[PDB]
Design a protein around this ligand. Structure first.
Ligand SMILES: [Mg+2]
Ligand SMILES: [Zn+2]
Lengths: 1319, 653
DNA sequence: AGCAACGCATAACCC
DNA sequence: GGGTTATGCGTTGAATTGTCCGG
RNA sequence: CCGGACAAUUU
């Protein structure tokens, strides 16, 4: 069962894998990000409330005042989207925050006296995001691109490659918080631990461990292990552990219970280890050299005299041994050293450390962080406690704490948000264990270690930064206040926050310029991911791991729709089904699989969870109920894929289109093309241009309808009903009785935007697609925007393709076109160029806009009016004056149309600032806007009141109906009729008061619109009025433009070919597009021939249906033909039943399909060669599809048959008249006497060093001298040469290089003496 | 420079000078009332920082910011670096009288001419148009000339034609690499806005037609014009200055047309007859009574340069075809006939063009090359090859081979899981058996594509070369190689992983049947590695070539002979395998120091001050000389330069 | 307030 | 007892150009 | 005027 509006054009779809999960909203990322940004959710929880609850509780120094905060609300924006973008104001809403300030009395803990409660104070105007996910800054349309950066936490790298040419591998830790100082635990080849703050210089770690309120004995007992010694008459015993000796090799004698186990030169093995654990004799014999090699931990004094025997962390000797033997000690704590178990890195670090006390440690820290300053003890203590144990200058996040606990293998995922001594000890122990050998490290290119950002989180961070920057001044003013007589709005400040949010939303490396010249480009840019903004990597400081995609890039980042140029591999995209995790990861849906039944329930797995479970492949043969038919299936476990069994799998991919994106999803037969070819094809499809007629594709993927619905370039009906009045400017929808609300049920009005300009000088138009008197459903397509047709994204067009060399016109990859294409006018795109006019008020008065200009012409003034502005609808060419402007001296300074773009003026808008007397032209223009606004508002009021009377008359019909009191008395008296005072009377009264409030709102809106048109807009301090004129250039196909397709193949038209010269078949139909077969072996596009064959089958079916409909046949034959054409194939999911249709629905279906048959082909499960051959056999086309043609010049049959067909191609946004440029003589620069460069400004080329070197390799000297001295540098030589040329004389003279003169003058201005001597 | 309004935009140097002047004024004012030591020391320190920021910022300490977050520039930072004067204005500079547009092909012109738009030609040659109009007298003054040029009635077009027939232009590409980058051609007024260059020079430029932008420059002084006509002409720089292979290389379409011409078969329409000459041969081919490629004994008549410049005519009969005779009609004068009897591949036609050049000369050689281009394009248009899905044939044994491959892989995996072998040897066995299966599939599909189609012989069957489109395209050397056709038809084999290793699970299917998502993602990353590192590779290559051209420039031949007897002892370089560079290509054109004697018993061969060429190379090959003591540029002892005797023959000549 | 690679520049070996 | 080697800081990283718009 | 951002080409 399907819908009713889909009966106009049903697309035949192939495939064998039934889908289960539909496609969600593609703008869901931006929608959820903005909702998370602005929301009235209590208890904070990562939002504005959280930031407020975190920073606002701030006391005062001596003001005895405390300012709190309750909630915050929002106001209605002063301007809406349409006219907001028309003018150029920042589409934003006033933000109001209610605050309260309490003041207590002295000699009291919290004894308050009087408190003030500020009711809705202002702190900044933040902009709101529309439903399409676009932002407005200055009348433009910019989309903030998400950022992929490093997750806040702890990481362990290796930095292999630069090991001082030693080969020893290193392991270092990187503790990175959310906002604060860093902490790197680096290593040295000499077995030593070091630390550093803010990446300054190498510093020891034992000093910090002691400064963290710890002594040498405590530090050693906490990190290292204790080796207790005992003193008896002889044989000093030592407590050794097999787990301790598993690394080093005990070369000494080992005996226990009178039995010698290990002698000298026997290596301890596993059997020796198990014997040692079984004996548990920690009292053996050790040599005197091993005791001297050991390191004592704590201090030890004498047992009689009390003198200190050995110091802390120092090697023992014979004197110390004799001292301990003559004493009476029985317990000595010592450290343990090893090479492959536990190294004494802390022991060497403490030995190198010159300090031994916390005071000296703090003094050294203060001296190293700020030299030339007296190291005060209290200041150093406060500085050390304010860096790692603070709640303002150092704070992590929830995801940061979760990642920290996950890396440290903890139990709880919550807790505090600052670093602690226990956390430092745990990280150091983990790093020591990693250096010892056990435990692996973590990489950076993995997705389980990184974290994606969003617009909401980034805006929250910027707002928090601004707030914590203004809190200093807030606290200063609060401390230097008064005696309970201030004002909250006067003590609060918001200028830094306003400036911060303004600069972030305007000038940002991520908030870039959107390209709305294509709905596909828009839906790709809305999900584009860029790791270029602040907090990540740059463009030149990158290697290869960050460029190549990690194997975990499955169903999240798309490796296809990526640009190529300076930055390759960094700019990425997002998959279709890929969602955002709650912490900030990248999620993907996975179908839950039982032991043998694939359940339709889905389960989401993150990056750190996907590597633990096994997921099967998408394109896998399975039964209808989800049963694996085969035993072996390709799976994966940790990025690297392999092959597993059946009872060993856990999950399975949801669909086969999740690994690809959405912009790259519109490429049919992606599996037939190579990776780079598909990449460039997706790119060139992103940078496209809508044609004149949005012709429906014939080999579409299937998601075109979903893309057009999710895009905001069409008018989707909100609540379905019945269509009553269709027009090319307004659509009125009368809802059915099913969707009828007791309050404001109403009609539905959808406006249609006409021919306007996009970002890339492209035209966007919305065309209707409904009929008069036709029911509709909820969520129905009613308009078709740019490159759309009946809710299907139709970018390019459909042409007749063929593959044969033709007189070398298609050299390496050139494209050959026919004259029929330019005759039927089907690729004539529309381009709208933006021209800006500026009228300032400089000296001697402003620049008046009047037609009394001296030294003019009647032929030029005929196109103008008595003000100096051309009318609406005049075709101008290169060299005409549009808006007349003069500067008082009087010099003419009007805006001239650039040469090369013959357009048409279609709209003229004048924005005059308030305070300037308008002329008669401005007066009549204002009257025209007021007139059209009044007409629009009046017709809107008319249709609304018509709906209200229809509703009230339908209410009066139900129940007591009286025809006499309905047809006799006038319509205005329909309030006192025969009707019971019940729910019907309630509906009548509510509709009456609704009509009253609608007329009140009409009057208020009319007054507001009149006031806004009469008043002036906001402009720059120095300009009076501005004129924005939109052109309309009709661009046709001209020899030099850029044709391409959906497979990566490029094409440049060389020369058009007539119909009589293009080859023709046996019927007489010539070919329109001819390619080069030589481009197939180069660029791997094996799908091109499949698309060609598919296009022949679809065109043949459409032509057969059109012929059958034209020759007048009964409906039964057409029904049978359509049923066979829709049921052919092996096993597809598109099952239709034509027996449940009407005759008119079949007639309309045939009339719509008379010009082609749309065929769907989902990416990795499209049509096959068997289905293509079956369709060709059903149609009147041969099986091979290679028909024999006739030559267009002479006329004979070729030696071998050629390949001809139909191909879906498109046009790029590169034109010959836009890419061409030429200049002979023009203006030059000012700093260096050199010509300018560019096309908008009359500039030339640039004879660079590489070509200069080429001319050097050639035996040419005079040409290079002329190019480098006469043409640009020597002004006198250039003028003399020009005079000799225009006079008729051929002589060149050298000159002094102005660049060399500038260089010598600068070096003279510097501190270097250079001069020119003479012989 | 001012901005939008009455405010003027400040400059970095202006701000630095203002700060320095303010600090100097403050110090001079403070050193009047006997200011204390601490204040005067702080003032001197601030003045020191100011003068440091004025001279050179960023070297000492931090860089003072003149804006929000951009570091301010100084004289040192502007002079040095990539944006310095030496690289932005001294060497590289902007020139006038230049244009730029998208190129096309236009295969209907000779060699010393190209295409150029009509409006662009009128705009670039405006001074020439003005001069011609003022010397003819159809204009009153400069204003009248401007009015006539902007109006374009009828005299401007013929004046432009007059100035185009005798004024060569110099086209230019932006990324120049070698010497052959700026040639000289003659424009033709063609309607449009694109450039129609010759298809033969495109392979030399390593250019294409994907919307590339090409620049043009026009000389305007008689010496430079003569220099261009002498050296910059395409009809002059045929030989490459690197090696001895010339630059005029037959393109892919041309070699495809010639391969279709000289492709003899075993039976055709009109096989088994005799005709008089290639004239009647092409007549019969156009009439249709005989096939294009059919064995027919046609009498030929050629010439030979066996005399001392005089040619000798001869007439004989040879068993050839029709297309070969038609191709032989455009041969110039003195060439053998055994050069058009083979399949005429890419290397074959290259050798034939080189031989024709080195035997006859230059102008008829370039004429013959242009004629070959024309006839190849014409016959390509006449025939036309087409790639088909049925023309591409999949081997019937690929399924069985891949089944045996998977069976062996499963056997190795089970043997490894049972506890017999290690993962290392398992991975080695997997990769070697997969490479073997890929090579087997490749050779099978190659044999299929080389002898799939067969024809009759007026009565029975006969096997020959297959008439497949892809096979012809791979055998004529047009586009595609062995691995290329392998990728197009059969298995692509394994492919490496980003770390450096290679994946143990290769690709099962090919491009015609159907890959899976996993294999697609594998090929995606395997190609993205190269697509990402090619940019930095090109950047490093550019830096290296810039350093080389900057370090080796000061060397101009100032003398002819230095009179030394030193050099490098030429020895045949051999690296493990076989002889890499032959002795002929090694000492091809280099004057030796001493008198090189014949390796016999005291026999003088070549003198000590003579140029060595092809005849001397043949003499050396016949005498079988082991090592030849030749001079060297590094062994030359010439004051300020290197003499011409220590270099030998000039390349590209 | 995150290169990468390589060289020149102080201030300790260990005979 | 002078001089051998880790550490700190100096330099740079192709080519030309259609676009956007910001201080 | 200097940078930022996108993008063509070096496939
Ligand atoms: Mg190109
Ligand atoms: Zn010499």
């Amino acid at each position: 069962v399907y819908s009713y509006t889909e009966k106009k054009r049903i697309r035949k779809d192939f495939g064998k894998r039934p889908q289960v999960l539909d496609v969600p909203y593609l703008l869901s990322i931006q929608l959820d990000s903005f909702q998370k940004f602005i929301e009235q959710d209590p208890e904070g929880q990562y939002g504005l409330e959280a930031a407020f609850r975190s920073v606002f509780p701030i006391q005062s120094y001596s003001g005895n005042s405390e300012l709190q905060y309750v909630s915050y609300r929002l106001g209605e924006p002063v301007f809406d989207v349409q006219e907001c973008q028309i003018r150029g104001v920042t589409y934003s809403a006033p933000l109001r925050v209610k605050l309260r300030l309490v003041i207590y009395e002295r000699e009291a803990p919290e004894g308050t006296v009087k408190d003030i409660k500020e009711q809705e104070v202002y702190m900044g105007e933040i902009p709101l995001m529309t439903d399409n996910g676009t932002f407005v800054i200055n009348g433009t349309e910019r989309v903030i691109v998400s950022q992929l950066h490093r997750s806040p936490g702890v990481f362990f790298d290796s930095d292999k490659g630069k090991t001082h040419s030693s080969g020893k591998v290193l392991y270092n830790a990187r503790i990175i918080p959310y906002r604060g100082s860093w902490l790197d635990f680096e290593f040295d080849p000499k077995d030593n631990l070091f630390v550093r703050i803010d990446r300054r210089r190498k510093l020891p770690a034992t000093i910090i461990l002691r400064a963290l309120n710890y002594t040498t004995e405590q530090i050693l007992d906490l990190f290292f292990e204790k080796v207790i010694f005992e003193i008896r008459d002889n044989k000093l015993q030592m407590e050794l552990v097999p787990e301790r000796l598993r690394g080093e090799t005990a070369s000494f004698d080992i005996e226990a219970n009178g039995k010698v186990y290990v002698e000298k030169g026997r290596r301890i093995t596993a059997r020796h280890i198990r014997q040692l654990e079984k004996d548990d004799v920690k009292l053996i014999e050790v040599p005197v050299e091993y005791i001297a090699g050991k390191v004592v931990a704590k201090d030890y004094i004498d047992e009689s005299t009390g003198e200190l025997i050995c110091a802390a962390n120092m090697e023992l000797s014979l004197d110390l041994l004799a001292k301990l033997s003559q004493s009476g000690h029985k317990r000595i704590e010592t450290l343990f050293t090893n090479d492959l178990d536990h190294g004494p890195y802390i022991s060497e670090t403490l030995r190198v450390d010159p300090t031994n006390d916390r005071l000296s440690a703090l003094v050294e820290i203060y001296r190293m962080m700020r030299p030339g300053e007296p190291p005060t003890r209290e200041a150093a203590e406060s500085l050390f406690e304010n860096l790692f144990f603070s709640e303002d200058r150092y704070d992590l996040s929830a995801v940061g704490r979760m990642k920290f606990n996950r890396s440290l293998l903890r139990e709880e995922i919550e807790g505090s948000g600052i670093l602690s001594k226990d956390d430092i000890i745990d990280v150091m122990k983990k790093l020591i264990d990693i250096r010892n050998g056990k435990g692996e490290v973590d990489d950076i290119d993995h997705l389980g270690n990184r974290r994606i950002r969003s617009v909401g989180e980034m805006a929250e961070n910027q707002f928090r930064v601004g707030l914590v920057r203004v809190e200093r001044a807030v606290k200063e003013r609060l401390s230097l206040g008064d005696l309970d007589t201030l004002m909250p709005q006067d003590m609060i400040n918001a200028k830094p926050i306003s400036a911060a949010v303004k600069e972030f939303f305007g000038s940002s490396q991520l908030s870039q310029f959107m390209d709305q010249n294509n709905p596909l480009s828009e839906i790709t840019h809305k999900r584009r991911i860029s790791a270029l903004g602040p907090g990540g990597l740059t463009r030149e400081r990158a290697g290869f791991e960050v460029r190549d995609v990690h194997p975990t890039h499955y169903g999240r980042v798309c490796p296809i729709e990526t640009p190529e140029g300076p930055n390759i591999g960094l700019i990425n995209s997002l998959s279709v089904y890929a969602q955002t995790n709650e912490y900030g990861f990248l999620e993907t849906p996975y179908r839950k699989v039982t032991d043998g039944v694939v359940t339709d329930e889905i389960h989401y797995l993150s990056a750190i969870e996907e590597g633990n479970y096994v997921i099967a492949q998408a394109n896998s043969n399975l039964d209808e109920e989800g049963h694996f038919v085969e035993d072996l299936v390709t799976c994966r476990s940790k990025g690297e894929s392999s092959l597993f069994s059946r009872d060993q799998v856990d999950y399975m991919d949801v669909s086969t289109q999740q690994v690809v994106s959405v912009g790259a999803s519109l490429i049919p037969f992606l599996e037939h093309d190579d990776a780079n070819r598909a990449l460039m094809g997706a790119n060139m499809q992103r940078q496209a241009v809508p044609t004149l007629r949005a012709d429906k594709p014939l080999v579409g993927t299937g998601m075109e309808r979903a893309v057009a619905v999710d895009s905001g370039v069409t008018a989707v009906a909100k609540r379905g009903g019945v269509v009553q009045y269709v027009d090319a400017s307004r659509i009125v929808i009368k809802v059915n009785e099913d969707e009828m609300y007791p309050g404001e049920a109403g009609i539905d009005i959808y406006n249609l935007t006409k021919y306007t300009r996009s970002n890339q000088n492209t035209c966007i138009n919305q065309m209707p697609c409904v009929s008069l008197g036709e029911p509709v459903e909820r969520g129905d397509v009613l308009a078709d925007g740019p490159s759309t047709d009946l809710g299907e994204l139709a970018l390019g067009q459909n042409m007749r393709v063929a593959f044969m060399p033709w007189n070398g016109y298609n050299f390496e990859d050139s494209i050959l076109v026919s004259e029929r294409v330019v005759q039927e006018d089907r690729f004539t795109t529309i381009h709208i160029q933006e021209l800006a006019c500026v009228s300032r008020d400089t000296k001697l008065g402003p620049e008046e806009i009047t037609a009394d200009i001296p030294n003019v012409g009647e032929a030029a003034l005929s196109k103008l009016d008595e003000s100096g502005i051309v009318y609406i609808g005049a075709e101008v060419t290169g060299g005409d004056i549009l808006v007349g402007k003069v500067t008082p001296k009087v010099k003419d300074s009007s805006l001239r149309v650039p040469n090369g773009v013959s357009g048409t003026v279609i709209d003229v808008q004048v924005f005059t600032r308030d305070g300037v007397e308008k002329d008669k032209r401005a007066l009549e223009i204002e009257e025209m806007q007021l007139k059209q606004a009044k007409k629009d508002l009046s017709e809107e009021l008319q249709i609304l009141e018509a709906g209200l009377f229809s509703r009230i008359r339908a209410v009066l019909v139900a129940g007591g109906v009286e025809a006499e009191k309905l047809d006799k008395l006038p319509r205005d008296r329909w309030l006192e009729l025969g009707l019971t005072d019940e729910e019907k009377q309630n509906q009548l009264e509510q509709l009456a008061e609704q009509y009253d409030e609608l007329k009140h709102e009409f009057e208020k809106k009319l007054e507001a619109k009149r006031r806004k048109i009469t008043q002036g807009d906001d402009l720059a301090p120095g300009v009076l009025k501005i004129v924005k004129v939109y052109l309309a250039v009709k661009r046709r196909i001209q020899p030099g433009d850029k044709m391409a397709g959906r497979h990566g193949n490029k094409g440049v038209i060389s020369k058009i070919n007539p119909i009589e010269d293009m080859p023709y078949d046996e019927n007489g139909t010539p070919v329109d597009i001819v390619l080069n077969p030589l481009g197939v072996p180069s660029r791997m596009n094996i799908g091109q021939i499949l698309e060609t064959h598919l296009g022949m089958a679809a065109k043949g079916i459409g032509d057969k249906i059109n012929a059958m409909l034209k020759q007048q046949q009964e409906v039964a034959k057409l029904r049978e033909f359509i049923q066979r054409a829709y049921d052919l194939g092996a096993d597809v999911r598109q099952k239709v039943d034509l027996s449940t249709f009407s005759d008119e629905e079949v007639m309309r279906l045939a009339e719509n399909l008379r010009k082609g048959m749309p065929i769907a082909t989902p990416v990795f499960d499209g049509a096959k060669e068997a289905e293509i051959k079956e369709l060709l056999k059903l149609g009147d086309l041969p099986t091979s599809g290679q028909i024999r043609l006739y030559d267009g010049r002479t006329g004979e049959q070729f030696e071998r048959p050629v390949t001809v067909g139909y191909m879906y191609m498109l046009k790029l946004n590169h034109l010959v008249d836009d890419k061409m440029h030429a200049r002979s003589t023009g203006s030059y620069s000012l700093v260096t006497q050199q010509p300018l460069g560019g096309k908008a400004q009359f500039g030339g080329q640039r004879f660079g060093e590489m070509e200069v070197w080429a001319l050097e390799a050639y035996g040419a000297a005079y040409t290079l001298q002329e190019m480098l001295t006469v043409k640009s540098d020597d002004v006198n030589g250039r003028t003399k040469m020009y005079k000799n040329i225009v006079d008729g004389n051929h002589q060149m003279e050298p000159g002094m290089p102005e660049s060399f003169n500038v260089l010598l003058k600068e070096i003279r201005s510097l501190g270097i003496n250079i001069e020119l001597e003479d012989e | 420079v001012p901005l939008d309004g009455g405010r003027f935009a400040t400059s970095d140097l202006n701000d630095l000078y203002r700060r320095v002047i303010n600090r100097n004024n403050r110090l001079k004012r403070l050193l009047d009332l006997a200011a204390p030591d601490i204040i005067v020391r702080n003032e001197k320190r601030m003045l020191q920082e100011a003068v440091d920021a004025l001279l050179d910022n960023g070297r000492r300490g931090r860089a003072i910011t003149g804006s929000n977050k951009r570091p301010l520039k100084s004289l040192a930072d502007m002079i040095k670096g990539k944006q310095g004067r030496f690289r932005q204005n001294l060497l590289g500079k902007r020139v006038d009288y230049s244009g730029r547009s998208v190129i096309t092909v236009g295969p209907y012109l000779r060699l010393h001419q190209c295409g150029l738009p009509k409006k662009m030609a009128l705009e670039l040659f405006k001074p020439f148009i003005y001069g011609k109009l003022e010397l003819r007298g159809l204009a009153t003054t400069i204003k009248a000339a401007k009015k006539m040029v902007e109006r374009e009635e009828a005299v401007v077009w013929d004046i432009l034609d007059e100035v185009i027939r005798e004024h060569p232009v110099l086209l230019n590409r932006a990324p120049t690499l070698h010497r052959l980058g700026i040639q000289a051609f003659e424009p033709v007024l063609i309607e449009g806005k694109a450039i129609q260059l010759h298809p033969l020079v495109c392979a030399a430029y390593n250019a294409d037609f994907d919307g590339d932008q090409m620049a043009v420059h026009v000389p305007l002084t008689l010496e430079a014009q003569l220099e261009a006509r002498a050296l910059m002409m395409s009809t002059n720089n045929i030989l490459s200055p690197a090696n001895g292979e010339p630059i005029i290389v037959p393109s892919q379409d041309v070699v495809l047309g010639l391969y279709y011409m000289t492709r003899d078969c075993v039976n055709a329409k009109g096989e088994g007859m005799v005709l008089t000459g290639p004239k009647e041969a092409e007549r019969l081919y156009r009439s249709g009574l005989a096939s294009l490629h059919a064995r027919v004994k046609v009498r030929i008549t050629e010439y030979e340069k066996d005399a001392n410049g005089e040619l000798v005519a001869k007439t004989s009969l040879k068993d050839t075809t029709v297309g070969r005779a038609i191709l032989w009609m455009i041969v110039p004068k003195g060439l053998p006939y055994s050069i058009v009897n083979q399949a005429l591949g890419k290397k074959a036609i290259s050798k034939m063009l080189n031989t024709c050049y080195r035997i006859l000369g230059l102008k008829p050689t370039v004429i013959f090359a242009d004629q070959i281009m024309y006839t190849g394009f014409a016959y390509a248009a006449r025939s036309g090859a087409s790639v088909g899905i049925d023309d591409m044939v999949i081997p019937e044994k690929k399924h069985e081979i891949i089944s045996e491959a998977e069976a062996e892989v499963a056997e190795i995996q089970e043997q490894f899981q049972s506890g017999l072998v290690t993962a290392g040897e398992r991975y080695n066995k997997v990769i070697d058996i997969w490479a073997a299966a890929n090579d087997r599939v490749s050779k099978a599909m190659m044999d299929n594509l080389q002898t799939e189609t067969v024809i009759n012989r007026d009565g029975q069957e006969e096997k020959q070369v297959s008439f497949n489109s892809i096979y012809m395209m791979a055998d004529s050397g047009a586009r595609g190689s062995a691995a290329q056709i392998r990728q197009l038809a059969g298995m692509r084999g394994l492919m490496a992983k980003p770390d450096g290793s290679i994946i143990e699970t290769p690709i099962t299917a090919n491009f015609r049947e159907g890959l899976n998502v996993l294999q697609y993602f594998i090929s995606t990353h395997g190609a993205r590695k190269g697509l990402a590192d090619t940019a930095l590779k090109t950047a490093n290559s550019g830096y290296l070539t810039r350093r080389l051209v900057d370090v080796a420039q000061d060397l101009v031949v100032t003398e002819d002979d230095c009179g030394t007897h030193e050099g490098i002892m030429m020895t045949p370089v051999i690296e493990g395998g076989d002889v890499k560079e032959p002795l002929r290509d090694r000492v091809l054109g280099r004057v030796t120091a001493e008198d090189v004697l014949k390796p016999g018993t005291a026999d003088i061969l070549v003198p000590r001050n003579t140029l060595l060429h092809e005849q001397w190379c043949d003499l050396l090959e016949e005498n079988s000389v082991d090592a030849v003591k030749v001079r060297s540029v590094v062994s030359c002892d010439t004051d300020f330069g290197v003499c011409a005797h220590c270099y030998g023959r000039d390349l590209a000549r």
